[model samples]
Each structure stands twice: as C-alpha cells, then as structure tokens.
Target: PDAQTVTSVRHWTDTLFSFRVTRPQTLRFRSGEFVMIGLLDDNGKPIMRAYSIASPAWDEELEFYSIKVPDGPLTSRLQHIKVGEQIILRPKPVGTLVIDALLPGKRLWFLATGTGIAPFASLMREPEAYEKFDEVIMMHACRTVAELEYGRQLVEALQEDPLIGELVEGKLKYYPTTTREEFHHMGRITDNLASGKVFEDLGIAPMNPETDRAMVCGSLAFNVDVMKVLESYGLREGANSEPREFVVEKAFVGEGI
Candidate 1:
C-alpha cells in the first residue's frame, strides 16, 4: 500500500492524457478489464476511480485512457501530472468488459464512441483476442474526425506490428464514423445499426448471436441507444459471472453532452 510509481505519459489531445505505470509482477487481469487508480488528496486520502487498462495483459507497462474533466475529482489533478508523479493503483483489477465475461463467437464487435475505445485498444493488442475469435471488427463513432485520436493510430499500428500484424492481416477491420461532420460514414451508431448503414460501410453481415459477440462502451445515452439495437439483433447483456452476447461500459460521466 505504500508503493507509488509513474512509468510514461502521453497526451492524445488537449483534453486527453494516458500514462503507463509499473505493473506489479503479481498483478494479473484480462486485457479489457478496469482497475481503481488515483492520486492522494492534499489531506492524504486516496481519491480513486475506475479506469480501464489500455495496454494488453502481457505489456510490461500499465496504460489508461482519460478525459480532462475541468472539475472532475480525479482528472482535474490527474491531467496535470508529470512522468515522475506518484499515483496509486489498487492490486485487484475488476470490470465486466473483460473478454472472459462474455461467451465466445466467430466475430467480435467492439462498438465504441469517444473515450469508449479505451478497452478496445487493449483488446486489439492482445494475441488472445485473435486466438479466441475468427474476426475482430472495431467501429468507432465520434462527433468529428479530430476527436478520433488514438483509435486511428492503434488500428494502423495493429496492421503494421510485425508480431501480431499477421494475426490481423485480413481479419481486423476498423470502421470510423462521425455524427457531426462529413465522413465516409456518418450518424450515431444506433442510427447506423437501425438503418444497417454500419454493416453497409464495413461490407459485413448483420449481427447474429450464433456468430457475433459484442462489447459496447460510451455515454449512458449512447450505451442505451446502441444496446437497444443490439438487443433487437438478438444480442443479450453479459457480465463477469453471466456470459452472454454483449457487455457495456460508460466512457465518461456525460462529458461533452
């Protein structure tokens, strides 16, 4: 409980920051799970919150994705931290979005918007993801292309990485759409699902429980919107104990809403 470490810091945009910390040799977690992380307050109390680990399980460094909440209890101070700043991480990482929390299927769909792509970043990097499924399709929706930060780079790297590159060669597909600007694909993910536009843009077939498993992360509204459509497509919600066709996580606390 007395250890504190800071490994690396990366700023994706004006309001986003991600950092890596030394991973304890004893710490173990599925690639897409989250953990409680925080910094000490002036009064010496921990001010922690759940953050999905953005790095794969085998990575030596632990990574996290975050929003620069001007008034957020954690982010306001967290976003200003430097490379050597001390931050605390709880030993046990827990979350429902972990791959084992859902049943296996042929195609794994990671549908996200904004910071929701955090977990998918980890999932895409893990060799186990490709080993468990035949195809990995990640669809990211944002208000504008500028907001589509690490998602673009992560996918590109996945395609180029010499190690896992071959695993995703013809199996991984990234679909990016914008709701507020003109992109090759446009509109909310829910609207796109209802209109079958998402599938059309990706040239993929519609979701089917027998073949497709999904993970969704976004705002409360966005989660509801997308989950409703997933339900219509026969995908049910799942958790760590109850495995099903889909799982969800909220990206932010109504940020930019």
Candidate 2:
C-alpha cells in the first residue's frame, strides 16, 4: 500500500476530470498499466478503483484521467480531490494494454472510446512507442467535441513539448471523432475501421496483420466490436505471454452507449 499526495487536479468536462499525484519513488510500471488507487471510506476502509495511469512511465509524477460517475461509489468522492490531499495508490500496476502484448510491427494503433482513451494517453507519451514502431495512431471516439478536448490538447502539447515533441513529432497521429454533437470527424470506431473510412481519411494503407499492431481499451461492447473488425483485417488478439498482432483491456462504456 502506498499513499501519494495530489499535486494538481483539472476538470475537463462536468463529468470528467484528471489529477496528478506524487509518484511512489520505487514504483516501476510500464506505460498503459492501471493501479488500484482511491480514498478511504467513512469507515476508514480504502475504497479503491482500477485506474489506468495516464502519464508515461517516465513522468516524474503520475496522472490519471477519469469520468465522474454519477453517484458511483468511489468517483463521487474522488472527483472532489484537491491538491495536497493524499490518495492511496497501490504500486501494483498491471494490465494488458501495454505494447509488450503485441509483436513487433511498423505501425502501432491505439484505439479507444470515451474514458477508455486513458491507457493510450500513457503509451502516446511513452518514448518506446516511437522507438519500437515507425508510427503510432491514436483513434479516440467520444460523444461530443467537448469530450474530446482533453485528449486533443494532450496530443497537441506532446507534439510541441520541447522534450517529447522531438521524439513523437513525426510518429504520432491523433484521430479524434465524435458520434453525437459532431465537429468534423463523426462515427463509431467500428464504423470508421470497418468501412475503411478511417484509412481513407488518413490516407494510409488499411491495417494489415504483417505491419500493424494494436492495443484496445473500452467497454465490453466496444471492445467486442472493435476486435471483430480487427480480426476481419487479420489481426489476432494476444497477451503478454503470447505476442500477437493486438491486445485488449476493459473500460467504461463508449460511443453508441
């Protein structure tokens, strides 16, 4: 068990926010892993939740992007967290969203919808994502333009950050879309991929098993549909023990929800 102090908290939308916490000195986890963290209940018992670390493995501090669940047990209280407050963050980080779960490839795809985008947030900032693959495509689907703001800003900042920008400048491609209240790109992640619309829009070759690797995180339905599309393209799901073309993890509901 570890307790880390909150350094900053940013509210992105009424139902979404992000916070930064002091990193545990000895905590060593790969980017895209989730750790158990939360506040204590009224009974002094830890009310923990599995939150994907949004910051890269190299960050001096830790960052987590979360949705404020309406009356949900942990988030209802966790959303009110302020700087200087302490939060219990178990150093045990584990997940299937890591790149190690896939085989080597030329392009890495990070696909998610809604809050599911959390893990990819880590991988995008991670240098290994660029060092290992020539391209990293981040496809994030949300309900509205406002909901896509955080990830949009994050990707923008990384492309310009003096340090990270140099590493990811030419490799990172951010494709953010909205299903409802659309701005420009609009459609479900499944439709975009299944219809070849995304590939056409990006002016890239369709995903092929030979050169494309992917990591998926989203709700049960979203993951299932996305996986179906990937499989149609010849991508097989794999795990850390067995490297393959892609991997998947779970998250809150996304899109057509």
Error of 1 at 156 (Å): 0.8
Candidate 2 error regions (>4 Å): 163-167, 253-257
In model 2, the Cα lDDT at residue 245 comes to 95
Please give each candidate's TM-score: 0.93, 0.96
Angstrom error of the Cα, residue 23, model 2: value is 0.8
lDDT of 2 by residue, 1-257 (tens): 79999999999998899999999998999999999999998999999989999999999999999998878878999999999999999998999898888888899999998888899889998888887888999999988888998899999998888987877766999899999894788999899999999999989999999999999888888889899999999999999899999998888534423
Cα misplacement distance, residue 180 of candidate 2 (Å): 0.3
Runs of candidate 1 with Cα error greater than 4 angstroms are 254-257
**In model 2, what are the clashing residue pairs, if there are any?**
none
RMSD after Cα superposition, model 2: 1.7
Angstrom error of the Cα, residue 35, model 1: value is 0.6
> Least accurate stretch of 10 residues (summed lDDT) in model 2?
248-257
